[PDB]
Amino acid sequence: NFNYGAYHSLEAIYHEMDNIAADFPDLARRVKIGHSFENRPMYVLKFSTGKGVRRPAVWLNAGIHSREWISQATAIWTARKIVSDYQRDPAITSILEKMDIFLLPVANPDGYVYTQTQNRLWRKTRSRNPGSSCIGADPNRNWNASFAGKGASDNPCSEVYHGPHANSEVEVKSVVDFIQKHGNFKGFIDLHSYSQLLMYPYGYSVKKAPDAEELDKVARLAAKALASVSGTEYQVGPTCTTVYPASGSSIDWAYDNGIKFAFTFELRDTGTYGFLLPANQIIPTAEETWLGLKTIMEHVRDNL
Amino acid sequence: ISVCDLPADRGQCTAYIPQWFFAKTTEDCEKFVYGGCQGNANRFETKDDCIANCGCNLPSKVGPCRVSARMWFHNPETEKCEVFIYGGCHGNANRFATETECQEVCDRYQKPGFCYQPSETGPCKGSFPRYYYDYEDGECKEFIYGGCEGNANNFETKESCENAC
Ligand SMILES: [Zn+2]
């Protein structure tokens, strides 16, 4: 009886992830991939039919920015969506048979609890860094992708502070280490909010990505599938030109590490509510996003 | 999205709608004209709403001039509103005439997450005057609580509410 149309505490989300894996031990496993600055576990749901050998997989990332609540809420509905529609929807069922889905609903647990209890708009980690009394680094400026180039601040008090060095944030290192150890990821989708954008590399430079053509095509296909639920409109493009320069971003790191299908979703809305998206929009957001996610995943299934 | 890193975007349309945006050049909240469609997230109905989004992490800025005066800014290092001397021109968004204004503006979206949920009366039929924080109004407002269940946005007095929220 988990209300997927409500925003939840970290505790509740972690627990629901556990129930999902309990109800589908055949299909879903809660794996701890690391810990946060404040020593909270980082949990992923692994979805698979491959009996424990490394298959090709897509990484679904959410909640790297803690105030972006629709992100985590969508990610956990999607956990339930994937299991509930396995062998009832040709679409996922066909994806799952070919490949594994790794889902990280709260990539920044410390920040998330901090938004729930202290500061609703908090964005960064809660790492405490020598040099300043300011707290946290922006985990989406912390990756080893033109780290510390244009598109990030070196002022620790900045919302977009890149941190002391690439992968300094243990939350980020945890994902990097785990994806690299695995070594055969094919898709990487990072969920954020808000603005309704679906973007692809690069953010650290105006340079076109070698796969820029196909990326835009898929993005647009996925954008259209998403629109086909309730009419929600997305714009598409590379990060640097669509929003701004951003150095050390996750989808750029991924793409430069041989994951071709690297996309960012900025979910709802466009500014009416902003970060404070009312709970009554979680499911509608999650339904539509699902189609865009499947479209991308189908496309990855087929290029394999 | 990092709202404060977006440029002004009037969009592709012909409307005439004055709004505010955070200007990265000057790091201050400024007026621009919106064309009613498309655009981006860096767009606010009032100056205070823009500062509440983008201003409160900036360092204090005295600026070039010396028509000096005592002002307040939200110090990101202490999360306290503190006094600084403003030269009179070219300052950034982190600048308020009074301590209270500085506190109320910068705390607008920085309250605990539970302060931003709708007041929930609950199922029960009691009537207990309780207060809750209403972010639309930006005030702790009286409401009437049923007596069981509900949520954390529920306080016995007003100063209790504004203490938490
Ligand atoms: Zn984000």
Swiss-Prot record, chain A:
List the keywords (alphabetical).
Carboxypeptidase, Disulfide bond, Glycoprotein, Hydrolase, Metal-binding, Metalloprotease, Protease, Secreted, Signal, Zinc, Zymogen
Q: Which family does it belong to?
A: Belongs to the peptidase M14 family.
What is the name of this protein?
Answer: Carboxypeptidase A4
Q: Where does a protein bind?
A: 3, 7-9, 11, 47, 80-81, 132, 154
Which cysteines pair up through disulfides? They are 134-157
Free-text cofactor note: Binds 1 zinc ion per subunit.
GO BP terms: namely: hormone catabolic process; peptide catabolic process; proteolysis
- Give the source species: Homo sapiens (Human)
Swiss-Prot record, chain B:
CDD domains, per this entry?
Kunitz_SmCI_1-like (cd22601), Kunitz_SmCI_2-like (cd22602), Kunitz_SmCI_3-like (cd22603)
The PTM entry states: Contains 9 disulfide bonds.
**Tissue specificity as recorded in UniProt:** Expressed in the tentacle crown. Not detected in annelid body.
Q: What positions does the record give for glycosylation?
A: 23
Q: Region Inserts into the active site groove of a carboxypeptidase and inhibits activity by emulating a C-terminal substrate: list its residue ranges.
A: 1-2
Keyword line: Disulfide bond, Glycoprotein, Metalloenzyme inhibitor, Metalloprotease inhibitor, Protease inhibitor, Repeat, Serine protease inhibitor
Gene Ontology cellular component annotations, sorted alphabetically? extracellular space
Question: A Pfam family in this protein?
Answer: Kunitz_BPTI
**Which GO MF terms are attached to this record?**
peptidase inhibitor activity; serine-type endopeptidase inhibitor activity
Name the domain of life this protein comes from: Eukaryota
Any S-S bridges, and between which cysteines? 4-54, 13-37, 29-50, 56-106, 65-89, 81-102, 115-165, 124-148, 140-161
- What InterPro entries does this protein map onto? Kunitz_BPTI, Kunitz_BPTI_sf, Prtase_inh_Kunz-CS, TFPI-like, TFPI/VKTCI-like
Domain BPTI/Kunitz inhibitor residue range list: 4-54, 56-106, 115-165
Residues binding a protein, per UniProt: 1-2, 109-111, 113
What does the function comment of this entry state? Potent inhibitor of pancreatic carboxypeptidase A with a Ki of 27 nM, and of the serine proteases trypsin, chymotrypsin and pancreatic elastase, with Ki values of 6.9 nM, 1.83 nM and 4 nM, respectively. Also inhibits carboxypeptidase A4 CPA4 and CPA1. Does not inhibit cysteine and aspartic proteases.
UniProt name for this protein: Carboxypeptidase inhibitor SmCI
Give the originating organism: Sabellastarte magnifica
Species lineage:
Eukaryota, Metazoa, Spiralia, Lophotrochozoa, Annelida
